[PDB]
């Protein structure tokens, strides 16, 4: 009942913000640009500093015209409406949002430890306890999101940032969506796609639990379970119903992963009658103190090295490009609600 009441309050608080979203809570010239932390086909993330408070933030900047061209309108509106309404210890917080004639802006908490992906590739693989510490945070985060009828749909090591305490902060809600029932959009990254996405079915929150299996495997092995050089070969392996496990995996880990990487979504852990509890009660999680993880009382396996809140050394280097704002409003209609 304590969990039921927690989730009921979480949903109430989410819905209040979901129904009346915040808008236009800062403007560009309140910030100094420091460094580009990441770039993509329609946007970028930059380290910025607030000129009056001195606080650092990560500012995601989306080019409205490119968002329209790449058919990402609904996805970007989803991302902002969801981020302004959620609140959970393992989600990067949205601090401000605004738009101008050219771009959409989401100003988030900066997480100087960088992406899990970088740390995983630098060390090779995580020990099972280390993988389990991160996995538990994802399980709780998905329990929270799913209780709000939210599907995340972009789990991968690049989207998990490691904070100053060694805990996970999930970022990039570009594919997150509120769904009661099914949804149909082809999205995700190839290695993490569930079979029902590849096969163009109407799919549901069970895709997140599949992706958790992929993530746990990749953390503990150092490479993802369906790896192949070409996407077509990845997809063939995903739908095949076969997975090979390193001999160093524990029997408990293999058993859990067989149940998360279950091709038949009606048999997949997280999607059975007992929901998330089939995962939380699995032997591989026997040592996990779920409340202590939520309360951030567990000592993390790894504290990222960084010098302070302005240190960018755990992110990589990109060509620094202008943030241009047109004299004329672009795509105003499409982004009215942002
Ligand atoms: N999405 C994204 C990318 C890089 C850094 C951050 C951050 O919140 O620190 C977020």
UniProtKB/Swiss-Prot annotation:
InterPro entries associated with the record: AGC-kinase_C, Kinase-like_dom_sf, Prot_kinase_dom, Protein_kinase_ATP_BS, Ser/Thr_kinase_AS, STKc_PKA
Modified residues (Phosphothreonine): 36, 183, 185
Tissue expr: Ubiquitously expressed in mammalian tissues.
Any single biological process term in GO: mesoderm formation
Residues annotated as catalytic: 154
UniProt PTM comment: Autophosphorylated. Phosphorylation is enhanced by vitamin K(2). Phosphorylated on threonine and serine residues. Phosphorylation on Thr-185 is required for full activity. Phosphorylated at Tyr-318 by activated receptor tyrosine kinases EGFR and PDGFR; this increases catalytic efficiency.
In-chain residues carrying the UniProt-annotated modification Phosphotyrosine: 318
Activity regulation: Allosterically activated by various compounds, including ATP. Activated by cAMP; the nucleotide acts as a dynamic and allosteric activator by coupling the two lobes of apo PKA, enhancing the enzyme dynamics synchronously and priming it for catalysis.
All copies of domain AGC-kinase C-terminal, residue ranges: 286-338
Main location as per UniProt: cytoplasm
Subunit text: A number of inactive tetrameric holoenzymes are produced by the combination of homo- or heterodimers of the different regulatory subunits associated with two catalytic subunits. cAMP causes the dissociation of the inactive holoenzyme into a dimer of regulatory subunits bound to four cAMP and two free monomeric catalytic subunits. Activates cAMP-sensitive PKAI and PKAII holoenzymes by interacting with regulatory subunit (R) of PKA, PRKAR1A/PKR1 and PRKAR2A/PKR2, respectively. Interacts with NFKB1, NFKB2 and NFKBIA in platelets; these interactions are disrupted by thrombin and collagen.
Name under which the protein is recorded: cAMP-dependent protein kinase catalytic subunit alpha
Gene field: PRKACA
């Amino acid at each position: 009942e304590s969990v039921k009441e927690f989730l009921a309050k979480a949903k109430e608080e989410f819905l209040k913000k979901w129904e009346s979203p915040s808008q236009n809570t800062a403007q560009l010239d309140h910030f100094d640009r420091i460094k580009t932390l990441g770039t993509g086909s329609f946007g970028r993330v930059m380290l910025v500093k607030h000129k009056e408070t001195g606080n650092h933030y990560a500012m995601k900047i989306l080019d409205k015209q490119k968002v329209v061209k790449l058919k990402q309108i609904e996805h970007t509106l989803n991302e902002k409406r969801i981020l302004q309404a959620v609140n959970f210890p393992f989600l990067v917080k949205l601090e401000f949002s605004f738009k101008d004639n050219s771009n959409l802006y989401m100003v988030m908490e900066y997480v100087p430890g960088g992406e899990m992906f970088s740390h995983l590739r630098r060390i090779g693989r995580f020990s099972e306890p280390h993988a389990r510490f991160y996995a538990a945070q994802i399980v709780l985060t998905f329990e929270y999101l799913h209780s709000l009828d939210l599907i995340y749909r972009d789990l991968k090591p690049e989207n998990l940032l490691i904070d100053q305490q060694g805990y996970i902060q999930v970022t990039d809600f570009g594919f997150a969506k509120r769904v009661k029932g099914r949804t149909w959009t082809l999205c995700g990254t190839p290695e993490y796609l569930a079979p029902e996405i590849i096969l163009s079915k109407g799919y549901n929150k069970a895709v997140d639990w599949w992706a958790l299996g992929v993530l746990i495997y990749e953390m503990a092995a150092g490479y993802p379970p369906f790896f192949a050089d070409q996407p077509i070969q990845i997809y063939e392996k995903i739908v095949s119903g076969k997975v090979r496990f390193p001999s160093h995996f524990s029997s408990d880990l293999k058993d859990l992963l067989r149940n998360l990487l279950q091709v038949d979504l009606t048999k997949r852990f997280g999607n059975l009658k007992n929901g998330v509890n089939d995962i939380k009660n699995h032997k591989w999680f026997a040592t996990t103190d779920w409340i202590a993880i939520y309360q951030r009382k567990v000592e993390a396996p790894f504290i990222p090295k960084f010098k302070g809140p302005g240190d960018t050394s755990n992110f990589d280097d990109y060509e620094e490009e202008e943030i241009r704002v047109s004299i004329n409003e672009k795509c105003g209609k499409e982004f009215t609600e942002f």
